[PDB]
Amino acid sequence: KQVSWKLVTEYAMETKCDDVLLLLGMYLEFQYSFEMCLKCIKKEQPSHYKYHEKHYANAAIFADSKNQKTICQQAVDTVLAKKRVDSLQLTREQMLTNRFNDLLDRMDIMFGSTGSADIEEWMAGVAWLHCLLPKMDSVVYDFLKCMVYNIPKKRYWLFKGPIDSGKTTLAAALLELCGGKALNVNLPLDRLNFELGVAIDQFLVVFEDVKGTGGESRDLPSGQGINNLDNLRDYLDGSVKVNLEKKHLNKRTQIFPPGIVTMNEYSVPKTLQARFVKQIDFRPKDYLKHCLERSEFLLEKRIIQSGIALLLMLIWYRPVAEFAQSIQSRIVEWKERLDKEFSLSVYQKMKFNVAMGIGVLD
Amino acid sequence: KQVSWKLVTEYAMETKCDDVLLLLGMYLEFQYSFEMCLKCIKKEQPSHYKYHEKHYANAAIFADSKNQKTICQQAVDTVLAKKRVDSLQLTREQMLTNRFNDLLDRMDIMFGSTGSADIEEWMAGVAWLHCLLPKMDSVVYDFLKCMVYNIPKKRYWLFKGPIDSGKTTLAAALLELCGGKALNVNLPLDRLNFELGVAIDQFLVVFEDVKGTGGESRDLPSGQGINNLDNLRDYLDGSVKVNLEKKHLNKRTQIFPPGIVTMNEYSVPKTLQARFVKQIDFRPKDYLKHCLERSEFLLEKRIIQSGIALLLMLIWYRPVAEFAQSIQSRIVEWKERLDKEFSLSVYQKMKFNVAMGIGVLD
Amino acid sequence: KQVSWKLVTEYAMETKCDDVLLLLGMYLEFQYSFEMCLKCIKKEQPSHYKYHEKHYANAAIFADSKNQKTICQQAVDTVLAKKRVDSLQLTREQMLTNRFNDLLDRMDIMFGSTGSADIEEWMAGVAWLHCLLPKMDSVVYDFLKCMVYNIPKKRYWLFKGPIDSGKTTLAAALLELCGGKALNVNLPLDRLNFELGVAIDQFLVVFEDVKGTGGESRDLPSGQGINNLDNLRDYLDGSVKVNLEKKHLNKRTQIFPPGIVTMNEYSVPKTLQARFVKQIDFRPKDYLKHCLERSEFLLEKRIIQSGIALLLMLIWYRPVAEFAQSIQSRIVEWKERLDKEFSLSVYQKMKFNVAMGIGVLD
Amino acid sequence: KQVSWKLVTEYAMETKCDDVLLLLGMYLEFQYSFEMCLKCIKKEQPSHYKYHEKHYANAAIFADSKNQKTICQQAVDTVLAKKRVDSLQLTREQMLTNRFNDLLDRMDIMFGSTGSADIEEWMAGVAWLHCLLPKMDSVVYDFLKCMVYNIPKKRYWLFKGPIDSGKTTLAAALLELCGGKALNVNLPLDRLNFELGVAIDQFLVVFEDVKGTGGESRDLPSGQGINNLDNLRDYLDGSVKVNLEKKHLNKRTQIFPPGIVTMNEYSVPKTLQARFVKQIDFRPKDYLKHCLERSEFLLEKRIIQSGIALLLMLIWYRPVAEFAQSIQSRIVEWKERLDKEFSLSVYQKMKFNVAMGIGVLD
Amino acid sequence: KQVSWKLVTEYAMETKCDDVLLLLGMYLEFQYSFEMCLKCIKKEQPSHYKYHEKHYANAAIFADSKNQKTICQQAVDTVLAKKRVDSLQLTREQMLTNRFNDLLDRMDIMFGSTGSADIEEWMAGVAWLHCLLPKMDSVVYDFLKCMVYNIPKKRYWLFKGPIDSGKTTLAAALLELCGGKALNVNLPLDRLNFELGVAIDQFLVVFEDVKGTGGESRDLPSGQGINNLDNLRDYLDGSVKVNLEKKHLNKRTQIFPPGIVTMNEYSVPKTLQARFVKQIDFRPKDYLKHCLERSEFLLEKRIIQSGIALLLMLIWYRPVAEFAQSIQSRIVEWKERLDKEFSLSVYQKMKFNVAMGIGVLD
DNA sequence: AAAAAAAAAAA
DNA sequence: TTTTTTTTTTTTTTTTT
Numbered sequence A, B, C, D, E: 001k002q003v004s005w006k007l008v009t010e011y012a013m014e015t016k017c018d019d020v021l022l023l024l025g026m027y028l029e030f031q032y033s034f035e036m037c038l039k040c041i042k043k044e045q046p047s048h049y050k051y052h053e054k055h056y057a058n059a060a061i062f063a064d065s066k067n068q069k070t071i072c073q074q075a076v077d078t079v080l081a082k083k084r085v086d087s088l089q090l091t092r093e094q095m096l097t098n099r100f101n102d103l104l105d106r107m108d109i110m111f112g113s114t115g116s117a118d119i120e121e122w123m124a125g126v127a128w129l130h131c132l133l134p135k136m137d138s139v140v141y142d143f144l145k146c147m148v149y150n151i152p153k154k155r156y157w158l159f160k161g162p163i164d165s166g167k168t169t170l171a172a173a174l175l176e177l178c179g180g181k182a183l184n185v186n187l188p189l190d191r192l193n194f195e196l197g198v199a200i201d202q203f204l205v206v207f208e209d210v211k212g213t214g215g216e217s218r219d220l221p222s223g224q225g226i227n228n229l230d231n232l233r234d235y236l237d238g239s240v241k242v243n244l245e246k247k248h249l250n251k252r253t254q255i256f257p258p259g260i261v262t263m264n265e266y267s268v269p270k271t272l273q274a275r276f277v278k279q280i281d282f283r284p285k286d287y288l289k290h291c292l293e294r295s296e297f298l299l300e301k302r303i304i305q306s307g308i309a310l311l312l313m314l315i316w317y318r319p320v321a322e323f324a325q326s327i328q329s330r331i332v333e334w335k336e337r338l339d340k341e342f343s344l345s346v347y348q349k350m351k352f353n354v355a356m357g358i359g360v361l362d
Numbered sequence F: 001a002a003a004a005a006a007a008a009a010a011a
Numbered sequence G: 001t002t003t004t005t006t007t008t009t010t011t012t013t014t015t016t017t
C-alpha cells in the first residue's frame, strides 16, 4: 500500500512547518507504535502527542519510502504557498488578528493546568512595564494603530536615549507582540544589501542600535549606521515597492515594512528626521533598576522582554471594543479570568512597589 | 482520472499569475466545494469567487498529484511566454491601451455596487493633485506622449526640489498609471548589475532620490547615486541595445525603458544633464500641507499617490479625441458617469478649499 | 534480492554519520566476509567491529547497487533531520545529559580490556588539575549550572592571568566537556560577520585571548579584542535574539550562546567588566611546572587539556544525587569502579607529590 | 550482456583515479584488441599495460553503453569515499608507510628494466647529501620519528644558516618524503588567515624564509615573519585544536601539523626559541660547491632535492628493524639489490670524491 | 531501428570536435540525401564532404531523436577525456612539437590561397630581423632548445638595451613563437602574488621594462623592478616547486616556468645577474632605422613583431635534421615552397638593401 | 546549497 | 511511450578593495 502525500501535507499545514528537515525529523517519530510512545505518555510536545494516533498508520509506510525528502518538499512548499497567498490577500487588521490568536493559544498553554508559568510574575511584568513610560498602554495602542494603518511616510517611530534606558527591552516586546525581525544597519554597505533581505514578508522591523558619527565627546562609539540608513529613504517611506533579495534568490518586489529605530544620543540628518512620525525619549530612573535588583525573576524568565507581557497589559487596560470583532470572545474570557484569579488591590500594590523601588512581590 | 494541465494554464492566464507559489497557493483553495465556500459566499476576492465553481472539479484531482509544482511551472512559464510575445509585437500605444483597460476594470469593480470606494473621496484627490503643479493635466498628458514615442536621447524627465515637495508622490502615481519599476542606484556598482536587471520587459523605470555629492553645504549628505547614473549613459540614451541580467539566467538584450529621475537639490554633471528632456522644479506649498491634516483619508487610503487618481484627472480634463479608439467608448461612459455623480460647483468648491488649506470635503 | 535502505539508515543513526562520503566509505567495508575480517579481529575501530557481523548480508547487495549515493543521502538526511528536532526541543539539561553519556561511552572504550588508557595516568591528571585552582570541582560544577541556566547577563565568565597560567588548558577542557567552539574576535570588524557565524547552534563559545589596546608598556601587544566586545553588549547579555550567517548560507536568528572570555593581564573598561558573573584569576605555580617536567605523559597524551579529565573529576568529587536522574545509575557504576582501582591514600599521595613538584606517580 | 559497474570501480580503486574524465579516458583505451596494443607492447605506462588484459572484455561492452559518465562517477566516488575513511582512521605510522610504498612503487619502475634513471647517479646523490651534515641518516631518521609521534611542544625543528648553505634543499627533500606544504608567514596579518588554511589535513608544513627585525649588522633584509611566528604559539605547540580557513569554505578545526622553520642568521626572541626541539646549523662548504661544479647532473636531474634520494639513504644506512613490519619485505629486497649494484668501496669512493671536491663519479 | 551513439562519437573523434553545439549543427547537415548534396559537390569543407555518405543513414534517424543534445554530450566528453589522457603524459618536447604543428596549420592559410598578406614583405621581415643580431637564427634555435630542456639554473636570458633598440620587438616575437605571457614586476611587494600567479600551467614567461635605481644618471625613470626580481631566486632557478596564487582561488604547486628578462641599461646587481645563462646586448643601428623609415610596411603590417616570422626564418635557415620527427615531414613539404618562390640572390638583395638603409626591392 | 533541467529505471 | 526516479552542475557568494 502506498504512502499518502496528502497526509504529510496536512500535518505540515496544521503544524505550520516550513523547514524540510524539521518536517522530516518530526514525521519520522510517528513510525513507532502509539501504545508504547513515551512522548505521548509524558506529553512534552503538542506537535507530537496531538498527532501520533492520527498519523501512525501512514508514517509506518513513509518510513520505508525512497522518496522521503521529495514528499516533504511538496508539503513545505504547500505551507509556503499558503503563507504567500495570505501575505497578498489579507488586510493588515486580519494579519494582526491572526497573530493575537497565536499568542492567545500560547497563553492558553502557558497558564493551563499543565503550564509552568504563573500569573503574578507575568503581571508584575505588566506592573513594571507600565512604569517605564507614562500612559504606557496608550503608547502601545497608538503603536499598533500606526503599524496597521501603514500610512506612507508616516510609519516609523524613533526610540532615543542613553544606554541602559530600556529601549530594546521595550522594542523586543513590541516585536514579539506583532511578529517581525530586528536588523543591524551598522554593517559595511557591501553586505548591508543582504541584511535588508531579512525583511521580506515581515509585518514589522526594528533597526536596533543605529550608530552615528560624532558624539565621541559624549563617549559614543562612532559608526556608519546613520549614514547607511540615510540611503534607504524609499524603504522608510513605503511610497514605492522596493526590490529585496536573498542569497541565491532572484529579487522580490514589495513595500518595505513599517517599524522602529532605536538609537543613542547621536545627531540625525534632516533627511531622516523628516521620515519619523514620533520620537520617544527614554531616560534612566533608578527605582526601576533597584526594583529589578530586588526581584530578578523578571529577567531570569525573560518575562520583561516578552510580547505576551504587552498582550496581558492590553487585555488589562483597554476596552473590549478596541479589538477585532472576531477575537472579542476570547478577550472577554481572559478579562473574566484576570478579574477572577487576580485583584486590582494587588495590582495597585505592585505598581506602588515599583515606584518605591522595592522588589515587586510580597 | 488525471489532472488537466491545460486548465491550470488557463487559470494562470485569466488571472495573470506569474509566480509559482502564488499560483499553487490560489489553485489549492478550489479543493473545497463551492456549494458552501465561505470565500465565494463573501465575494471577498474576485480571482477566487469568479473561478472556484469552474475549477473545483479539476482542483479536487490536483490536490492528490505528486508533482504539483511542475504543473504550476509550465503554467507560469506560459504566462511569461505570452508576456514576452506582447512586448515585442505590440506598439507602445497598444501596450498603454491595455494598461488603461486594466485600470478601468479595477475602477469598474472599485466603484461598483460591491466596491468599497466612494468617488467623492477620489475626486478630492484629483483636486489636490491638480493644485500640485501648474496645468497638471497637461503635464501628465505630455508625459504619456513622451513615454510612448520613446525618442532616442529624449526619454527622461528630472523631478527636482527640496524635502516634502511631492516628487515621490507624483512619481509613484505615474509609475502606477503606466506600470513599471522603481530602481535604487545609491548602492555600489558591484551589485548594481543585478538591480538594473529588474528593468527587463518593463514599460517604465523610476530612479528614486538619487543621492548626489557636495550637498553638505546645504546639509544634504553625499552618496554614489549620480556617479552611478553617469556610468549608465547608454542605458538612458536608448540609442542602442543593452544587456540585462537575472541571477542564474543568461543576459537579455533590449533597449532600456524610458522613465523619471527624482532628486533633491544636488548638482549634476553636464554629461548626465544632456540626457534629460525636461526638468520640473517642485516646491512646498503651505496650504497643501494644511489641507491634508484636515483630510487624512487621502493618505490613509493612498489616494493622491495612486495611478487611478491620475486616470480620473485625464478622464475629467482631456478631450475624448486624446485617447485610443479602442477605449473611447469606455471613456465616454466614464465621462458620463462623472457627469451624473458631480457638478462643476462641487469640484470648484473642493479646489477652493484646497487652495485655502481647508478640509477637502467641506 | 534488493538493498534495504532501512538498514543503511540504522547504521547511520547508530554511528551518527552525517557525511555522505564517510558513510559510503564505511558501509562498503562490510562487503567482505566477516569470518576473515582482520579489522574485526584486531578490534581497531568500534564503528566497524560492532556492526560488520550484522550488516554483512546487506552490504553484499549494496556493493552491486547502481544508486549508492542516493541510499547514503537519505540516510544522512535522516540523521540531520533528527539533529534538527533535538536541537529545537531538548532542554539545555537534556542536551548536557546526552553529552555526558556520550563521553561515558568513550571512557568505557578507553579504559576497557580492549582499550589503551592507563587509568592511573588519567587519575594523576585529575590530581594535577585539582591543584590548578582552589576548589576546582566546585569551579567546574558551578560553571555547568551557569551554562545550563543561561540566565541573561549572569552567563559569561572571565579568565585572566599571565601567559603560561593554564587559561586555555582549562577552557579547552570545558569545551570538550560541554561542546561548543572557540572564537577569535581580534579581527577588524569587516570579517566578524563570518567569525561570529561559527556560534550557530553551539552550546558554548570561548573567546580566545581577546587583546587589549592599551597597557602595551608591560609588553602586551595592542589589539582590537576588548574594543570589539564593547560593541557586542547584546550578544553577551543574551536578553534578545541576534542574526548569524555562514558563507553561502542565509541568516539564522537565535540567542547567542553563553561562554567564557580569556585574556592576558590587560586593563578592561567597566562598561564590559559588568557583563561577567564571575572572574577567575590564574597565576604561575613553580611546583606545577616542576611536576610537569617530571610527569611529561600528562602533556604527551594531552590529558590535562581533555574534558574526560574533568568528567573523571566530577565523578570522583560530586555526590550522585546532583546528576540528572537518567544518568545516575551509570555514574554509580563508575564511582564503584574508581573506588576499586584507587583509594584515598593513593590519591592524596598523588596530590602531595604535585604540591611539592616531585612528579605524580612516585 | 551488460557492463559490470563493479569491475569499472575495481580498476579505479587499484589505480587511485580521483578524476572522472581521466577514468573515462583511461578505461576507453582498453576497448581495442589487446593482441596489437602498442602501449601493451612497449609497456610504457603500467596503469595501462598491467590491466588491459583483464578489462578488455568489459571495456568492449562499456564502449557501447549509453551511461558512460554515470558509471565513472560512482567509481570515482568510491575512491573518494575510501580516501576519507583512511584520513580519519589511519595512524601516522600507517600514513607514512603508505608513502613509502608509493615511493618504492615509483622506484621499482624508474630503476626497472625500462628504467630511465641511472642508479649510479642517484647513489652519487646519496653520497653528496650524506656529506652536507654530520650523521645525516640519523638526522633524517630522527626527524621521521618526530613527525610520526607529533608529541605536544616537541614538534618543530629550526634550520639556520646563510644564503647557499642547503636549508631549502633538505627541506624540499623531506617534503617529498613525508608530504606537506610550504607556508610564507612574512605576509601582513591580513593574509595569514588564508596562508594557514593551506595546512589543512597535511602531514607537515615548512615555513620558508622566516625573516625578522634587525640583522642590519649582517646586512640582512628586515621583515615581519619572526614576530608573526612568536604570536602563533598554539599552532606550534599543538596542545589544542585550532580553526583553519580556506577561501569560500567555512572553518575547519584540527591539530595544526608538525614541521620545519627556515631562516637566515636573524636574532630569535627567547620566547620563540623555546618552541623548537632542535636547531640545525647549516654552513657553506666550498668543497661541496666544487663537487657540484664537476657533478652538474646532480642539479640538472634534480636528484639532491628529491625525496627518493633520502629513501635510498635510509635503505642503505638503516637496519631493517627500524622500518614498519608491513614494508620490511620490500626493504630486504631493495637491500639485496643495492648490495650487489654497489660495493662498499665504490660508495666510499663516491663519498671520498665529494670530500675532495672532485667530480663525484671520477 | 535506432541511432548509433557510437557513430556520432567516431565522427566527433575523427573531426576532433569538442563543442556540443558545433557537433550538433554539423551532424544535422548529414540528414539530406548525399546524391544531391551541394556542400559535397562544391567540396567546401572536408569535415563535410569526407563523411556525409557514411553518416547519412544514421543522421536520418538522429534527426527524429528527442535526445540530440544528450547524444552529442557523450561524443564530446569522449574527445575531452582522450585529450586529458594525453595531456597528463606529454613530454615537454612534444608540447612544443604540438605548438609548431598548430602554427603550420595556420601557415597553410597563406599556402596556396590569397587569404593572407603577401609573403614577399614577410621575407623582408625575415631579412630585417636577421640583421638585428649576429647569426640571429642560431640565437632563436639555441633559445628554443634551452626552453625545451628546462635545466635548473640554466633557464633565463637577459636582453639589455635603450629605447629604439628592438629588444621589445624580438621579445614580443619570441613570446608569440612560444606561447608564454608577459609579467610586470615594478610593483610594490603588496601586488606581486597575483602577478606571479599568471604563470600557472604555462610554457614561458617574459619580464618587461624591469626598472632599476639611480636612473637619473641617464634620465631613466626608477621603480622597484630590479630590487624585486633579485628576491625571486626560487622562481628563476627552478630547482624546486613553488606555490602560486590567482585571485579568488587556492594555490597550485608547480615549477615556475623558464623565460626572458628585458631590461634598460640600469645597473644590475651581481646576485641577480648570476642567475642568467646569457646576456644579449641590443644597440641602435641607423641603417636598420633608415630601412624601416623607408619600408613602413615592416611596422604597419606588424611584420617585425609577429612571432610567426621567427618560424618563417627557422623554416628556411635550419637543417631538416633539427626538427622533431612528427613535423620533419611537414617542414620539408613546406621547405620547397620558398625554394620555388624565392632565390638566394633576391634574399641577399633584401639583406643588402636593409644593410644599405633602403627598402627591400626586386 | 538551491535552482534549473537533464538523464535513467520501471510500468 | 508513460510514469517514477536519479543525476549534473553551475552560479552565486566570497573575495578583493
Ligand SMILES: Nc1ncnc2c1ncn2[C@@H]1O[C@H](COP(=O)(O)OP(=O)(O)OP(=O)(O)O)[C@@H](O)[C@H]1O
Residues within 6 Å of the ligand: A162, A163, A164, A165, A166, A167, A168, A169, A170, A209, A262, A283, A284, A285, A286, A288, A289, A292, C233
Ligand atoms: N529607565 C530605566 N532606568 C534605569 N535602568 C533601566 C531603565 N530601563 C532599563 N533599565 C535597565 O537597563 C537594562 C538594559 O536595558 P535595555 O537593553 O533595554 O537598554 P537600552 O538602553 O535600550 O540598550 P541598548 O541601546 O544597548 O539596546 C535593563 O535590563 C534594566 O536593568
Ligand SMILES: Nc1ncnc2c1ncn2[C@@H]1O[C@H](COP(=O)(O)OP(=O)(O)OP(=O)(O)O)[C@@H](O)[C@H]1O
Residues within 6 Å of the ligand: A152, A153, A239, A274, B132, B161, B162, B163, B164, B165, B166, B167, B168, B169, B170, B209, B263, B264, B282, B283, B284, B285, B286, B288, B289, B292, B299
Ligand atoms: N508640494 C508639497 N507641499 C507641501 N506638502 C507636500 C507637497 N508634496 C507633498 N507634500 C506632503 O509631503 C509628503 C511627502 O511627499 P513626497 O515624499 O512626495 O515628497 P518629496 O519632495 O518627494 O520628498 P523627499 O525628497 O523627502 O523624498 C506627502 O505625503 C504630503 O503629505
Ligand SMILES: Nc1ncnc2c1ncn2[C@@H]1O[C@H](COP(=O)(O)OP(=O)(O)OP(=O)(O)O)[C@@H](O)[C@H]1O
Residues within 6 Å of the ligand: C162, C163, C164, C165, C166, C167, C168, C169, C170, C209, C262, C263, C264, C283, C284, C285, C286, C288, C289, C292, C299, D239
Ligand atoms: N599554573 C601553571 N604554572 C606553570 N606552568 C603552567 C601552569 N598551568 C599550565 N602550565 C604549563 O604552561 C603551558 C601554557 O599554559 P596554557 O597552555 O594553558 O596557556 P596560557 O599561556 O595560559 O594561555 P593563553 O595562550 O590563552 O594566554 C601549559 O600548557 C602547561 O604546560
Ligand SMILES: Nc1ncnc2c1ncn2[C@@H]1O[C@H](COP(=O)(O)OP(=O)(O)OP(=O)(O)O)[C@@H](O)[C@H]1O
Residues within 6 Å of the ligand: D132, D162, D163, D164, D165, D166, D167, D168, D169, D170, D283, D284, D285, D286, D288, D289, D292, E233, E239
Ligand atoms: N653547504 C653548501 N655549501 C655550498 N653550496 C651549497 C651548499 N648547500 C647548497 N649549496 C648550493 O647552494 C644552492 C642553494 O641552496 P639551497 O637550495 O639549499 O638554499 P639555501 O642555502 O637554504 O638558501 P636560501 O635561503 O636562498 O633558500 C644549491 O642549489 C647548491 O648549488
Ligand SMILES: Nc1ncnc2c1ncn2[C@@H]1O[C@H](COP(=O)(O)OP(=O)(O)OP(=O)(O)O)[C@@H](O)[C@H]1O
Residues within 6 Å of the ligand: E132, E162, E163, E164, E165, E166, E167, E168, E169, E170, E209, E283, E284, E285, E286, E288, E289, E292, E299
Ligand atoms: N636596431 C634598431 N635600430 C633602430 N631602430 C630600431 C632597431 N630595432 C628596432 N627599431 C625600431 O625601434 C622601435 C622601438 O624598439 P622596440 O619596439 O624593440 O622597443 P625597445 O627598444 O625595447 O624600447 P622600450 O624599452 O622603450 O620598449 C621598434 O619597434 C622598431 O620600429
